[model samples]
Target: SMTEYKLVVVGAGGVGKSALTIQLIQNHFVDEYDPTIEDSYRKQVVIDGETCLLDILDTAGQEEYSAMRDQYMRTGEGFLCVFAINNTKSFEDIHHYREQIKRVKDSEDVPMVLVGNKSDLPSRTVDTKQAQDLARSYGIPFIETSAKTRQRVEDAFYTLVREIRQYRLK
Candidate 1:
């Protein structure tokens, strides 16, 4: 069976949002900080024997693009709200993204997954438990990923898509 879904990648600048999505779609990691203005990619992934075409919108994280985020939120059926596991500030900023999604979508039950990126880095600040607690509080799944090593990068997207699928079925 085949299905389609729209996903938005959002987080603060330098949090590896683009890298995760690019790695998942292109099978390569990006090691630079070039702010995204909204790049879209299409990829077909198999989840639980189901073929899914994911329409991904990688949104900008800079403050200048703050106004544009709500529009992206409105269009997304699911969201991968990312943060760098090594950056406490980036982890702290995740709530704002979650809140914005709620405000724009006007719902408390959006299909979202909290992703802590850059797990390959040795210098870490944000604890896995801290992120897991936040996700539990929001009733969402928390995943740690390393774009460089490709650790759980696919799981992050697949989890969000699965959640979206389950939500739609309800």
Candidate 2:
């Protein structure tokens, strides 16, 4: 069966949410791309050969937009939650973002992918085990990717689709 899904990429400022959005939307890797500069919206072709219209509500990472982000979180069917592998602040905020999304979506089964962006920087890595553990705790898939290298960028989105489909099928 074919289906459409609404997904939103969100995280702390400078966590490569925009970069992930571009990779997922454009289906091409672009280094140093910014999705928040001019109203970002895009769609992707799912593995099921269906398409997902991604709203990508790139909310202002500023504190003022917290409520606004929460609103979108509730309405979104899926989320691409990104965090820079080398940035501790982004990692620290992941918990807050996850909590907000859970509160808004009110469903633990909502498809969410934890993206550890900027994997090209090997030396800058913090710890994969920590991130994997976090994703396991939340029961969401996790993938470390690099937009610069075009690694698992597209798979990240389609993987979520497959996951949702399997859950629905069961």
Candidate 3:
């Protein structure tokens, strides 16, 4: 039987969480930033030669929904913690999301990936080193991508799925 994974896309508003989720499976890039409100999508994916179903939940980033994040975190098996490269505040907020995941899930070893979105832009405020250091500290994979340019978008999703698969084996 093929396993199913629940992957949650999370970040501050306008950090490209929705854009990345849509681009990964929608086959089209959305230039405008539209706030997501707990949208879910399902797609079949192959990770490491194993087929699996991905149930992606794109959570809203607005402050109003902050209380509901714990509910979202409780259901997700994995997460793609996204932050825009041009925004330092988004990068800083990643820790809050991670903490929430740990609190709700009650596991520090949850499968997740640190994603730096909008890699196509020339004006990047968040340094690669900063993001890498955070990922390294948390022992999660760090990936950079651009939803508009489709740069490493597939890789980011696949990487999280792979991590989820690996976690199940342990």
Best by TM-score: 1
Q: Model 2 over residues 77-147: C-alpha lDDT tens digits?
A: 67788889999788878888777777776656677889898899867655999999999998889999887
The list of candidate 3 runs beyond 4 A from truth reads 62-67
Q: What tens digits encode model 3's per-residue C-alpha lDDT throughout 23-54?
A: 98888987775575568999997777778899
The list of candidate 1 runs beyond 4 A from truth reads: 62-67
Error of 3 at 27 (Å): 0.7
Q: Write the per-residue lDDT of candidate 1 for residues 38-117, one digit (tens) a residue.
A: 58999987899999999999876546356566567788899998899888998998888787788888887799999998
lDDT of 2: 0.72
Better of 1 and 2 by TM-score: 1
Model 2 residue pairs with clashes: none
Which of the two candidates, 2 or 3, achieves a greater lDDT against the reference? Answer: 3
**Residue 52 alpha-carbon offset, candidate 2, angstroms:** 4.8
Give the higher-TM-score candidate: 1 or 3: 1
Off-target runs (Cα >4 Å) in candidate 2 are 27-40, 44-46, 49-55, 62-67, 167-170
Q: Go through the candidates in order and give the C-alpha RMSD of each one to the true structure.
A: 1.6, 2.8, 1.6
